[PDB]
Write a protein that binds this ligand. Sequence first.
Ligand SMILES: *[C@@H]1O[C@H](CO)[C@@H](O[C@@H]2O[C@H](CO)[C@@H](O)[C@H](O)[C@H]2NC(C)=O)[C@H](O)[C@H]1NC(C)=O
Ligand SMILES: *[C@@H]1O[C@H](CO)[C@@H](O[C@@H]2O[C@H](CO)[C@@H](O)[C@H](O)[C@H]2NC(C)=O)[C@H](O)[C@H]1NC(C)=O
Ligand SMILES: *[C@@H]1O[C@H](CO)[C@@H](O)[C@H](O)[C@H]1NC(C)=O
Ligand SMILES: *[C@@H]1O[C@H](CO)[C@@H](O)[C@H](O)[C@H]1NC(C)=O
Ligand SMILES: O=C(O)CCC(=O)C(=O)O
Ligand SMILES: O=C(O)CCC(=O)C(=O)O
Ligand SMILES: [Fe+2]
Ligand SMILES: [Fe+2]
Lengths: 670, 670
Amino acid sequence: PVNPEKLLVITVATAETEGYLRFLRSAEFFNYTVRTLGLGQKVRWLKKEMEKYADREDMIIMFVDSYDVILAGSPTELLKKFVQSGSRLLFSAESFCWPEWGLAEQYPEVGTGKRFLNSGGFIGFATTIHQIVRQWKYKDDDDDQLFYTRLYLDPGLREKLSLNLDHKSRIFQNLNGALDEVVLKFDRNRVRIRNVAYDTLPIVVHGNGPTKLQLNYLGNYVPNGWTPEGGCGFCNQDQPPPRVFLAVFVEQPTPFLPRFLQRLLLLDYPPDRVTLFLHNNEVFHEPHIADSWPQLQDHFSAVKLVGPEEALSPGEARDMAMDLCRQDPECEFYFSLDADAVLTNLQTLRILIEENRKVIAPMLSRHGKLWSNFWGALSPDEYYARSEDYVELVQRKRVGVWNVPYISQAYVIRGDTLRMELPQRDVFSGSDTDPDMAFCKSFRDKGIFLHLSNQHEFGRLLATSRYDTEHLHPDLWQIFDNPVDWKEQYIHENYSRALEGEGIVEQPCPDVYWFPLLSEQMCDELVAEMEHYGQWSNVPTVDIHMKQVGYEDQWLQLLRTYVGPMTESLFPGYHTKARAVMNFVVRYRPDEQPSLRPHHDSSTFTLNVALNHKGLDYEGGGCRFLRYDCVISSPRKGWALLHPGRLTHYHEGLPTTWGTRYIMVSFVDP
Amino acid sequence: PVNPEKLLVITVATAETEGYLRFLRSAEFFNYTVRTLGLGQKVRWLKKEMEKYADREDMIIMFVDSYDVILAGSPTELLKKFVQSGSRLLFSAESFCWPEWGLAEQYPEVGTGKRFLNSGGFIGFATTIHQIVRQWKYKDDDDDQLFYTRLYLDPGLREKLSLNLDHKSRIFQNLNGALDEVVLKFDRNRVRIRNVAYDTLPIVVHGNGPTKLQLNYLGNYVPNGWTPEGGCGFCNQDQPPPRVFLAVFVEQPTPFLPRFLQRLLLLDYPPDRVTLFLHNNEVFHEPHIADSWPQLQDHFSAVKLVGPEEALSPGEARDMAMDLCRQDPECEFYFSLDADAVLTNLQTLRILIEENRKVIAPMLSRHGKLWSNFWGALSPDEYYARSEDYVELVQRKRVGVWNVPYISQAYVIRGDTLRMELPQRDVFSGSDTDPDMAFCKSFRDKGIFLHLSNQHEFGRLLATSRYDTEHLHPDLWQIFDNPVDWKEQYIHENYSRALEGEGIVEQPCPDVYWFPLLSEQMCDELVAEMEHYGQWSNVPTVDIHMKQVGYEDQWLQLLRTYVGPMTESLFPGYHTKARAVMNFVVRYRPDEQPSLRPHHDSSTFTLNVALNHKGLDYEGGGCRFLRYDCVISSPRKGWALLHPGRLTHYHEGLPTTWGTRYIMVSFVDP
Ligand SMILES: *[C@@H]1O[C@H](CO)[C@@H](O[C@@H]2O[C@H](CO)[C@@H](O)[C@H](O)[C@H]2NC(C)=O)[C@H](O)[C@H]1NC(C)=O
Ligand SMILES: *[C@@H]1O[C@H](CO)[C@@H](O[C@@H]2O[C@H](CO)[C@@H](O)[C@H](O)[C@H]2NC(C)=O)[C@H](O)[C@H]1NC(C)=O
Ligand SMILES: *[C@@H]1O[C@H](CO)[C@@H](O)[C@H](O)[C@H]1NC(C)=O
Ligand SMILES: *[C@@H]1O[C@H](CO)[C@@H](O)[C@H](O)[C@H]1NC(C)=O
Ligand SMILES: O=C(O)CCC(=O)C(=O)O
Ligand SMILES: O=C(O)CCC(=O)C(=O)O
Ligand SMILES: [Fe+2]
Ligand SMILES: [Fe+2]
């Protein structure tokens, strides 16, 4: 048994990049001892280091890269596997032969394993290593592969110093040419990989060639990145703050944007330490931003608008917003947030900063689906592809902070990373690539990790694909594509609490029920949308139907989702599908039709919703039920009334004395 | 001016028939003085009477018949008109020439009036009359017409004694050949006739030839028979009773016959003075008569049945019933009453007897139409024809007792008239004539008047034309043809009082109403009719619909007539047409389906009627309304329940513990 205390890991690193520190923590997990050289040219550095270990027969030494390497096994298993190899210096094997390709005939014939050599990782005796590395006397420009290559192809030297290759990946697993051979193997508190082509559990995982992101994905688990019983290994889980530059971007017509601007005033973070930047490409949103801008500039320390008059493409706008933080030494962090991002959690900026990352993004997914603000993998064309664990991450099966090749719409970048590591302005611009794709590619080409955190519930994304802009109030027609947000602005706040009970629902007259349904904004926007049409009109009324305006299917879904479940709750035994042919708003002013004579309605039950206040917009009677000697004298605006429409409830519309009355009614279940 | 005290009216009468006494009362009305001869042969009697008045130049004498004659004018007008004639002996004129027809050329040419002579009535001086009547020396067999005839055709004798004819009916109106010339002329307290062909108001109306009934019709008004301001002239208007033989006849299947037999026990007349006779030609009614016969024989003094086993035609049965009264000197009156005659008034026998007539009948008409138990006129073939005042009599415009040529189904005959005036047995039988027609013709051929009285409301006739006899209870299917009687037996007695109010209707639970609808007989006959079918059977039940039995249209009319008006009364504002596709009776016994799970009904409102008692037929729960915490614990048999079927009334059929439950239900207004 070789003593672990005589195994040394030697690696090269000119800078402490994020890939190097990841390699170091995988080594400290297995309690390795690592010698880092320099905090073909690295062969010159290894050769110099091996002159101290020229006579060290007692020492095993393994040399690997650091930027694209992670350790998966313990040193004792590593030394044990090296003894079974029966070699004095064991190299790594690969599926390809490079630099020179014609040397493929030189190599010995291997049955099923890999045949060629890879200098990215080898292990052997310090004496045998020294006799090999010290023969190097060449230029720094020439690669390291060709040197160790033909030395192995020397048949006499191959037999004298016992040189062999890890043909079946017992210790070294090179990913290029074997991505389909590598899977992960989980355990209680550690993860590992397995070569299913030879059924081996390698120690060293090296992401050579175009397998960088494949190692970033493996690096999220191996060795203790994420464990099924311990979770993440490096995320947080359980006096002034930094100064941040908040950059809002409105590059497309975004629904509920007034709610976005009002939400910026509620982020739990000292506003005097946040500098707001806002770019608006749409002339549609200039009113909305103008309404909120007085509150914005009085809340934050400094603000700035770049409206549509500058005519800046989204790439040029994102360059300027980030460059204004890089050229400001007081900008410690840069928070870029798009308009189509709703942040339910109001501490994301604090939590994302405390993760102490360079580029971290909060995970946001559209309500109920899989699409999110990140890509688990890429295609050869750098287009989208689904990773093996993409769905487990979106569904929050496995939580933590993950090395992800793509992020968008929301991310926090360290300020010093911008000036020192990505100092150019053409981050988003410069090519025919999408401005959000060139952003992520600009960070990966610098070896910078794009972190995605799903440890908390952060928020959701808005469906802004087909946003019909030809409406006086476009957010009304958004009951289909963004229902969870449509309910927050239009459904009464105490409606959901009314469905569960709590005794807020009232029965003013026998078999008529009174519950809050619509919000004051829903009624005001509905009245305005009706008057904007203008063309007002077997008891007759002065009314306008939702069909001629184009809001029937939208109001029918409000019936299916909100009044149906409310009907079955108040009438135990009745089941409703919310079918209604007659949906219309009625006007009551003393100049035309101030009242409505007694009548029945051709429907099973009716829903009568007020649309304005009592005493502010008009003064007059409500709804009178003759057979019961009971009248709804003081109606409530956002509240609605439910009564059977046939036989039992002969009701009369009492006259309006002054002003104008608006009510919404639907003869449902005819 | 001739003094009325020297005008004498001479007439012939071998017996005081009803036609003679009618002529006498018309004379006493105008205060005439009449000499009746004998209480061609009557010429011998007149000639003998004229020998006392041979030298009486001061006396005017008018000779007319008595049986077919009524007086229409006063003597002063009669004498005044005779003076204007300028004649010493004025005869009556006629359209026909008889006996000998060839003597038509003898008569003087008359322009437009009647040309020939009629010896039925003449007026003149007693001296001129004597010189004419005393020339008669012929046989009693030869008629009186030919004697006075050719004496007028003697041209010299016609000019010597001044003989003329009332050519234009100034005084004498002979009806034969001038029926279209005669109309009535009314006044405040007297009636009169008018010859619209000459515009004269005659004094004497003589019904010669086949115009007997036409005079009976005129005799009902002229002179004071019926006056518009005084009404009838001889009817009643404002201590033992006689003994009567009551004869009931069942010659056809008659509906509601059990109610007829039970009604015979309620006629306000001493039963110990009534002898019941009943003929039943139908085997269908032997059960019904057998059920009531114990009560009949214990009520009346003597009874007798002649069932279908004797096989007697209706003519032979009516002969026997009346002959048994004629051959009984103790039978003072004979009351013949048919089965299809409902007597609402229970004093008709008393009132018809107190009219002191020979043959009087109470007027009965089918409810709402014109057909009655009498004919106002006849046709040449003695078939039916409508009289000028037939509709005024049926509609009770003109009231009183009327000389009518036909009666049926109900009449009271004096006993002495049967033995003395119509003693033969072949009254109804003897010819191919209908037995009811030969009855009336047998009385008119004896100069006996058939009186019809409509001074009171007596009753109605039953529609027994198409009586479907192939039913366990045939009176159920009689809601169409006899609704007024169908309601008396099947509709609850307190239903009509419930519709008007009086606070008998109850509201046991909110918006459910409880009112009496059906009678105990209606439910018992409906349950039996259902079990007689036997074939019992989206909540399911053990039920039988009215359609498969054949009682849907009948139950639909009960809905249209009785539950519709009851719905609109209790729900002000709702209008019902009583449309129902689902009408069925449900069984509830613990052996198959004892209960019914909570459910709604596919209808606007439902009518749930119990069909048996609580505690006598079964013991179990009623109807429970879940949403109201209210249960119909103790239902009432004949009562019904009305509740809305949708949404608001989720109800459950509570289990029946013992016995069998029957309920009638109709899902009306789907
Ligand atoms: C929803 O319900 C809450 C409480 O159930 C309402 O809050 C009350 O509002 C009234 C008038 O606005 C105040 O007088 C009370 O003091 C409030 N109570 C609390 C506990 O805040 C709220 O107003 C309801 N929503 C709407 C739209 O009216
Ligand atoms: C119809 O109503 C009358 C009274 O409104 C009912 O007559 C009463 O009947 C009960 C029980 O049969 C007696 O105890 C009372 O004494 C009766 N009152 C009178 C004034 O007679 C009659 O029963 C109702 N009809 C039916 C079929 O029940
Ligand atoms: C590293 O050392 C710690 C404590 O010194 C020990 O718990 C852990 O198991 C060691 N790891 C290995 C791979 O031996
Ligand atoms: C008959 O006499 C009575 C009273 O004596 C008288 O009222 C009536 O008018 C008289 N009738 C005629 C026709 O003169
Ligand atoms: O005006 C009211 O209060 C009742 C209106 C109504 O019910 C209807 O639209 O028919
Ligand atoms: O049995 C009851 O009381 C209710 C029956 C009913 O309503 C039905 O026929 O559906
Ligand atoms: Fe209404
Ligand atoms: Fe029911």
